[PDB]
Amino acid sequence: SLLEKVLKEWKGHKVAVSVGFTGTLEDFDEEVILLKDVVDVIGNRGKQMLIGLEDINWIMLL
Amino acid sequence: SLLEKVLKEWKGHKVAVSVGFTGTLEDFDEEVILLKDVVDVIGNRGKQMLIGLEDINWIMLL
Amino acid sequence: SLLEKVLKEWKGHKVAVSVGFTGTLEDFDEEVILLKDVVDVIGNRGKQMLIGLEDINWIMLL
Amino acid sequence: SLLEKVLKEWKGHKVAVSVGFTGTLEDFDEEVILLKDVVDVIGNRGKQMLIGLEDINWIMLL
Amino acid sequence: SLLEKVLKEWKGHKVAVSVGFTGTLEDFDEEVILLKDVVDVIGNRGKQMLIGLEDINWIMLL
Amino acid sequence: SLLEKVLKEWKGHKVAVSVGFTGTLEDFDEEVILLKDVVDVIGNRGKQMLIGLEDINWIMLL
Amino acid sequence: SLLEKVLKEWKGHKVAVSVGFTGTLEDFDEEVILLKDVVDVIGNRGKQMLIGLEDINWIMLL
Amino acid sequence: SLLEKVLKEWKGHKVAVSVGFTGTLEDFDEEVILLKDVVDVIGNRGKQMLIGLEDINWIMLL
Amino acid sequence: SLLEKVLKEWKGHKVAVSVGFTGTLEDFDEEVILLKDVVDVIGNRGKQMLIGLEDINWIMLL
Amino acid sequence: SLLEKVLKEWKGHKVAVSVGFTGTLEDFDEEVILLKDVVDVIGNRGKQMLIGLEDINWIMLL
Amino acid sequence: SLLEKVLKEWKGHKVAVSVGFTGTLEDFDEEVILLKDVVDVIGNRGKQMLIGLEDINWIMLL
Amino acid sequence: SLLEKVLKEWKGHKVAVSVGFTGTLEDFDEEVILLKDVVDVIGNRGKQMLIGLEDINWIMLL
Amino acid sequence: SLLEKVLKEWKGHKVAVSVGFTGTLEDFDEEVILLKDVVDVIGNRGKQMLIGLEDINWIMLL
Amino acid sequence: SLLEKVLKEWKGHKVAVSVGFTGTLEDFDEEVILLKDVVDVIGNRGKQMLIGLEDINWIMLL
Amino acid sequence: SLLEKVLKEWKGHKVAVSVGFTGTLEDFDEEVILLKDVVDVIGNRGKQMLIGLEDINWIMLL
Amino acid sequence: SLLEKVLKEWKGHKVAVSVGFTGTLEDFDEEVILLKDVVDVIGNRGKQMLIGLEDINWIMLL
């Protein structure tokens, strides 16, 4: 998948995501992605974060 | 599933969840997750909470 | 099902439900839940209530 | 079917419905329910009313 | 079907319909209903009207 | 006042109103209008009705 | 005021109100109205109720 | 007023109005406009219509 | 299909349609319908118009 | 003010309020009201609560 | 007023406008502006158009 | 398909499309349509445009 | 002001505020309130916070 | 005014604006600002543009 | 696939997308498209961007 | 002015704003505030930013 290909490459890099938040992309598979070091514009938000691809509009590398 | 793997690791830890609240990820499976000691900002909300995964935006380990 | 198991456990007890109200979880199954003695922030609402699992956000035990 | 079982016992009695109205439950099956002598807060609403269960949030025995 | 049964009986009678209008129910099948003499509160609207059951919330006999 | 002048002549006659309902125009002044024998598409709506002109979009002689 | 005139006359009578509920109109002045015996379609709601004229769309006598 | 002048000019003529319909600009003033013989994409709507200038978006001459 | 039957009869006649405009039902099939001489209230809108049935609320013969 | 008069009488009694919660009307004046022992359906929400009148839809004595 | 100055210069030229359409800025004053040869994307919409400034987001010289 | 047939017919010609713009129907198939030389009420928008049939309301020929 | 008096009383203490967050009411006046050590259901949010009384729904003391 | 001061300085520079678009700020006064060379992400939009300060959320220098 | 065929030829060129952003089309397949050097009206938006075709309204060659 | 007093002390420090964005507080007065080196979650947003206090919900020292 172009999606597998790219997400492999993006693994390690800070990314922004639209669900309907930013942080480093720790891992992913066909149903979810997982983020480390998650921040909002005001501060840190959580060690990790799970998000399903179903509810994801776009992902963007920083 | 990265989902299974991660939730296993998160089991016991305080987590926040988005549907459309925070507590301890007591337990889970494919269809639902179960929170313990669910609080809101104002205070406690209730001894436990079931939540369907189909309506979960994102879960986040604090 | 974590859902069957926990619901078995909560039968008898007061619970809050968000659909899209609180009362005693009288009974349930794969499709619906039956509440008994239903209250609202203003007062009584009904001897009973049927609710489909499909349109429930979360059920919470008090 | 908890739903069937429960709907049997409510037949004859005044009930309330959230769809997306109150009146006596004439009949029901899998697809729809039929309400007799439907009423609004403001007054009557007409001899009968069909309602498909798909768009029903909850029903409630008064 | 309770729905077939009733709509047969309601055929001939003025009815109101919620799609997401009133007039006499001329005919129906599993996918549509057809109305004659359609009025709004301000006046007549159209000799006939087709409406699919998919987009119909409730039907009500007058 | 075109508004006064015109409302005089419509007094007695069935009218329609958009507020944010149809029935006979009993009376009016600067602040409100009074409608008699108010009607809905679905049926009657009650002996009378006050309506403040501020929230009225248009009125219409039928 | 046509509004004073009518509300005097309507005093005693059950009325419906649109704010943005029904019951008997116990009293009113230029800023508020007060209702006794307030009901919704499901049941009683409260001995009394205050409502400011600012947020009232229409009032209707039953 | 460019508004008075142009309205004087358009009296007699068909016009469309957006509030928040089309018909002949029968008359007008500082507060309202009176339309005569009012039509909708489906047909007639009313012998006449009153509309306040406050809630009109644009008036257009055809 | 009552739908097929009726649309056949309506073919040639001016019709109004709701999606989310009026003209002559030129032709149709299962997936779409085709309008000719499509006008709006303000005027003509265009020589023809295709419209998918899946997004049609109601069609109405004028 | 009927408002002053009534709120005086209601002072001490449990009341529900709409802004956009229930408790004891502890005290009030022109600009605000103060609730004591404010609960929601799920439980207690907080020792006290101020609320501006400008944003109050309706208050209701239970 | 920069507004007066600019609109003077724009008088005669094709302009687009946002309220909540494009044509020639025929004329204007404090309360309103007047467009000539108002077209939309699909075609012509009407000989002229008045528009109140209070409801204008932005005007733009093409 | 009435859709294939009519689209074959409209290839070459200017058309308006509502999604959820106007230009020449350059080409199309079962899934998408390709527009060439795309215009908006304010001006040009693009050398070309791809659009999925799924999210089109109506296509109209000018 | 019931508002001044009660705010004097609550200075020092944790409070929840709804605007359109919780923290210590550090200080206040006729126009605004200053919060210190601000928390959200997920965690810290800021050393401090300013908020205008105009856009506050309710302030509540915990 | 801090607002006069800054807008003087920003005159000449490309800016973005939120009304409820970007280009160079040609001039301004207490009621409006005027933009030259206005672009959207897709292309140019208009030689100039007027926008009233009333409907402007923020302005931002680039 | 008109979609495939057309996307090939646009590869390398700056494009615009409506999702629910502009930049060079790096690659694509059935499930997603990849945009390089993504840009906002206000400025850059980050090295790359994945977008799933499901939530794409239209794409547009500039 | 608590507002003035407090804004003085925050000048120089990174702050967050809800309007209807974060960056260093350059200056302020009654009508507006000026933010320097404005930032988004996704990245920079431009040298400076004016914001009128009217549409500001809260400001927050980080």
mmCIF file of N, CA and C in Angstrom, chain O residues 2-61:
data_model
loop_
_atom_site.group_PDB
_atom_site.id
_atom_site.type_symbol
_atom_site.label_atom_id
_atom_site.label_comp_id
_atom_site.label_asym_id
_atom_site.label_seq_id
_atom_site.Cartn_x
_atom_site.Cartn_y
_atom_site.Cartn_z
ATOM 1 N N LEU O 2 -10.167 6.229 -15.536
ATOM 2 C CA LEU O 2 -10.074 7.675 -15.755
ATOM 3 C C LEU O 2 -9.304 8.255 -14.579
ATOM 4 N N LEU O 3 -9.632 7.819 -13.353
ATOM 5 C CA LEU O 3 -8.948 8.362 -12.167
ATOM 6 C C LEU O 3 -7.450 8.079 -12.215
ATOM 7 N N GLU O 4 -7.074 6.824 -12.464
ATOM 8 C CA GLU O 4 -5.647 6.496 -12.549
ATOM 9 C C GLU O 4 -4.994 7.295 -13.686
ATOM 10 N N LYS O 5 -5.508 7.103 -14.905
ATOM 11 C CA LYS O 5 -5.006 7.796 -16.105
ATOM 12 C C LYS O 5 -4.738 9.268 -15.832
ATOM 13 N N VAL O 6 -5.744 9.941 -15.293
ATOM 14 C CA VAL O 6 -5.661 11.378 -15.051
ATOM 15 C C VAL O 6 -4.656 11.735 -13.955
ATOM 16 N N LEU O 7 -4.605 10.919 -12.898
ATOM 17 C CA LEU O 7 -3.686 11.173 -11.785
ATOM 18 C C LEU O 7 -2.200 11.032 -12.204
ATOM 19 N N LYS O 8 -1.901 10.029 -13.040
ATOM 20 C CA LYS O 8 -0.581 9.911 -13.693
ATOM 21 C C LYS O 8 -0.108 11.258 -14.260
ATOM 22 N N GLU O 9 -0.932 11.845 -15.125
ATOM 23 C CA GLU O 9 -0.560 13.042 -15.872
ATOM 24 C C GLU O 9 -0.395 14.263 -14.974
ATOM 25 N N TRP O 10 -1.112 14.288 -13.851
ATOM 26 C CA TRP O 10 -1.020 15.403 -12.883
ATOM 27 C C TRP O 10 0.176 15.256 -11.909
ATOM 28 N N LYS O 11 0.768 14.054 -11.864
ATOM 29 C CA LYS O 11 1.903 13.796 -10.968
ATOM 30 C C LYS O 11 3.055 14.740 -11.314
ATOM 31 N N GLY O 12 3.569 15.427 -10.302
ATOM 32 C CA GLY O 12 4.586 16.434 -10.492
ATOM 33 C C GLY O 12 4.027 17.835 -10.388
ATOM 34 N N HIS O 13 2.737 18.008 -10.658
ATOM 35 C CA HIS O 13 2.186 19.355 -10.743
ATOM 36 C C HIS O 13 1.466 19.709 -9.481
ATOM 37 N N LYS O 14 1.528 20.984 -9.131
ATOM 38 C CA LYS O 14 0.795 21.573 -8.023
ATOM 39 C C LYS O 14 -0.723 21.318 -8.170
ATOM 40 N N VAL O 15 -1.376 20.840 -7.111
ATOM 41 C CA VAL O 15 -2.817 20.544 -7.186
ATOM 42 C C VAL O 15 -3.565 21.056 -5.970
ATOM 43 N N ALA O 16 -4.888 21.194 -6.060
ATOM 44 C CA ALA O 16 -5.681 21.550 -4.875
ATOM 45 C C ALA O 16 -6.686 20.472 -4.565
ATOM 46 N N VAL O 17 -6.996 20.357 -3.274
ATOM 47 C CA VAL O 17 -7.859 19.296 -2.767
ATOM 48 C C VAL O 17 -8.875 19.852 -1.804
ATOM 49 N N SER O 18 -10.105 19.357 -1.920
ATOM 50 C CA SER O 18 -11.134 19.587 -0.913
ATOM 51 C C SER O 18 -11.319 18.249 -0.253
ATOM 52 N N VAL O 19 -11.132 18.259 1.077
ATOM 53 C CA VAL O 19 -11.201 17.065 1.941
ATOM 54 C C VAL O 19 -12.166 17.348 3.097
ATOM 55 N N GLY O 20 -13.327 16.679 3.117
ATOM 56 C CA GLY O 20 -14.412 17.001 4.078
ATOM 57 C C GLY O 20 -15.336 18.130 3.613
ATOM 58 N N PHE O 21 -6.054 23.269 1.432
ATOM 59 C CA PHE O 21 -4.734 22.652 1.290
ATOM 60 C C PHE O 21 -4.386 22.403 -0.158
ATOM 61 N N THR O 22 -3.190 22.845 -0.529
ATOM 62 C CA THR O 22 -2.649 22.673 -1.872
ATOM 63 C C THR O 22 -1.174 22.256 -1.750
ATOM 64 N N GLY O 23 -0.675 21.557 -2.770
ATOM 65 C CA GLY O 23 0.719 21.137 -2.842
ATOM 66 C C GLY O 23 0.928 20.154 -3.987
ATOM 67 N N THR O 24 2.184 19.818 -4.279
ATOM 68 C CA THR O 24 2.555 18.964 -5.429
ATOM 69 C C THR O 24 2.185 17.483 -5.289
ATOM 70 N N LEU O 25 1.659 16.872 -6.327
ATOM 71 C CA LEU O 25 1.197 15.513 -6.170
ATOM 72 C C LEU O 25 2.362 14.531 -6.266
ATOM 73 N N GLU O 26 2.858 14.060 -5.120
ATOM 74 C CA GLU O 26 3.943 13.063 -5.107
ATOM 75 C C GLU O 26 3.476 11.734 -5.701
ATOM 76 N N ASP O 27 2.518 11.072 -5.051
ATOM 77 C CA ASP O 27 1.992 9.797 -5.581
ATOM 78 C C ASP O 27 0.548 9.532 -5.132
ATOM 79 N N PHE O 28 0.026 8.382 -5.562
ATOM 80 C CA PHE O 28 -1.351 7.994 -5.379
ATOM 81 C C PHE O 28 -1.528 6.494 -5.658
ATOM 82 N N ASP O 29 -2.569 5.931 -5.067
ATOM 83 C CA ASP O 29 -3.110 4.646 -5.477
ATOM 84 C C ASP O 29 -4.595 4.649 -5.070
ATOM 85 N N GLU O 30 -5.269 3.506 -5.237
ATOM 86 C CA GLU O 30 -6.692 3.369 -4.896
ATOM 87 C C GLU O 30 -7.057 4.015 -3.541
ATOM 88 N N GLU O 31 -6.337 3.654 -2.477
ATOM 89 C CA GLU O 31 -6.700 4.064 -1.099
ATOM 90 C C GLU O 31 -6.400 5.530 -0.766
ATOM 91 N N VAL O 32 -5.198 6.009 -1.110
ATOM 92 C CA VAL O 32 -4.754 7.374 -0.743
ATOM 93 C C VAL O 32 -4.009 8.135 -1.840
ATOM 94 N N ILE O 33 -3.776 9.421 -1.574
ATOM 95 C CA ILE O 33 -2.839 10.209 -2.343
ATOM 96 C C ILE O 33 -1.851 10.908 -1.411
ATOM 97 N N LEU O 34 -0.661 11.159 -1.949
ATOM 98 C CA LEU O 34 0.403 11.758 -1.210
ATOM 99 C C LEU O 34 0.764 13.102 -1.814
ATOM 100 N N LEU O 35 0.694 14.148 -1.010
ATOM 101 C CA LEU O 35 1.037 15.489 -1.446
ATOM 102 C C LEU O 35 2.344 15.971 -0.822
ATOM 103 N N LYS O 36 3.206 16.556 -1.657
ATOM 104 C CA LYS O 36 4.518 17.047 -1.263
ATOM 105 C C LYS O 36 4.511 18.556 -1.194
ATOM 106 N N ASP O 37 5.239 19.088 -0.221
ATOM 107 C CA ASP O 37 5.394 20.526 -0.014
ATOM 108 C C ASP O 37 4.045 21.185 0.111
ATOM 109 N N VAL O 38 3.270 20.701 1.064
ATOM 110 C CA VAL O 38 1.928 21.190 1.274
ATOM 111 C C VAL O 38 1.957 22.601 1.794
ATOM 112 N N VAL O 39 0.985 23.378 1.324
ATOM 113 C CA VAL O 39 0.887 24.801 1.581
ATOM 114 C C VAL O 39 -0.537 25.186 2.010
ATOM 115 N N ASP O 40 -0.577 26.203 2.855
ATOM 116 C CA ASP O 40 -1.793 26.856 3.251
ATOM 117 C C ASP O 40 -1.820 28.214 2.578
ATOM 118 N N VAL O 41 -2.961 28.882 2.646
ATOM 119 C CA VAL O 41 -3.035 30.313 2.313
ATOM 120 C C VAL O 41 -2.061 31.108 3.187
ATOM 121 N N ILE O 42 -2.006 30.786 4.490
ATOM 122 C CA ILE O 42 -1.215 31.553 5.468
ATOM 123 C C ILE O 42 0.287 31.246 5.375
ATOM 124 N N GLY O 43 0.660 30.115 4.763
ATOM 125 C CA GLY O 43 2.065 29.714 4.678
ATOM 126 C C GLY O 43 2.200 28.228 4.514
ATOM 127 N N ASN O 44 3.412 27.716 4.737
ATOM 128 C CA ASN O 44 3.688 26.264 4.658
ATOM 129 C C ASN O 44 2.861 25.470 5.628
ATOM 130 N N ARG O 45 2.645 24.196 5.297
ATOM 131 C CA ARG O 45 2.018 23.246 6.224
ATOM 132 C C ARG O 45 2.783 21.925 6.461
ATOM 133 N N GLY O 46 3.949 21.724 5.877
ATOM 134 C CA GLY O 46 4.756 20.578 6.268
ATOM 135 C C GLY O 46 5.120 19.670 5.125
ATOM 136 N N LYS O 47 6.262 19.015 5.295
ATOM 137 C CA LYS O 47 6.930 18.307 4.214
ATOM 138 C C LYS O 47 5.970 17.518 3.321
ATOM 139 N N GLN O 48 5.097 16.709 3.910
ATOM 140 C CA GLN O 48 4.229 15.832 3.115
ATOM 141 C C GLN O 48 2.843 15.681 3.702
ATOM 142 N N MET O 49 1.959 15.021 2.958
ATOM 143 C CA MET O 49 0.598 14.807 3.418
ATOM 144 C C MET O 49 -0.070 13.656 2.734
ATOM 145 N N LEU O 50 -0.574 12.743 3.544
ATOM 146 C CA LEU O 50 -1.365 11.650 3.049
ATOM 147 C C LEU O 50 -2.802 12.063 3.105
ATOM 148 N N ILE O 51 -3.566 11.586 2.125
ATOM 149 C CA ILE O 51 -4.999 11.790 2.103
ATOM 150 C C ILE O 51 -5.687 10.612 1.449
ATOM 151 N N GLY O 52 -6.689 10.076 2.153
ATOM 152 C CA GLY O 52 -7.436 8.915 1.685
ATOM 153 C C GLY O 52 -8.515 9.404 0.765
ATOM 154 N N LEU O 53 -8.676 8.743 -0.373
ATOM 155 C CA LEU O 53 -9.608 9.229 -1.398
ATOM 156 C C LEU O 53 -11.066 9.286 -0.933
ATOM 157 N N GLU O 54 -11.452 8.408 -0.008
ATOM 158 C CA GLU O 54 -12.823 8.372 0.527
ATOM 159 C C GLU O 54 -13.339 9.748 0.964
ATOM 160 N N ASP O 55 -12.539 10.485 1.723
ATOM 161 C CA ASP O 55 -12.964 11.801 2.214
ATOM 162 C C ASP O 55 -12.574 12.967 1.268
ATOM 163 N N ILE O 56 -12.202 12.662 0.026
ATOM 164 C CA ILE O 56 -11.860 13.715 -0.943
ATOM 165 C C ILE O 56 -13.061 14.028 -1.841
ATOM 166 N N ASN O 57 -13.467 15.308 -1.809
ATOM 167 C CA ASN O 57 -14.532 15.856 -2.654
ATOM 168 C C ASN O 57 -14.077 16.022 -4.102
ATOM 169 N N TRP O 58 -13.037 16.830 -4.277
ATOM 170 C CA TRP O 58 -12.445 17.026 -5.574
ATOM 171 C C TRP O 58 -11.007 17.377 -5.446
ATOM 172 N N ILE O 59 -10.303 17.043 -6.505
ATOM 173 C CA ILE O 59 -8.922 17.388 -6.694
ATOM 174 C C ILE O 59 -8.875 18.256 -7.925
ATOM 175 N N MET O 60 -7.846 19.059 -8.025
ATOM 176 C CA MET O 60 -7.820 20.030 -9.052
ATOM 177 C C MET O 60 -6.413 20.390 -9.463
ATOM 178 N N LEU O 61 -6.108 20.150 -10.733
ATOM 179 C CA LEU O 61 -4.849 20.577 -11.332
ATOM 180 C C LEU O 61 -4.810 22.094 -11.502
#
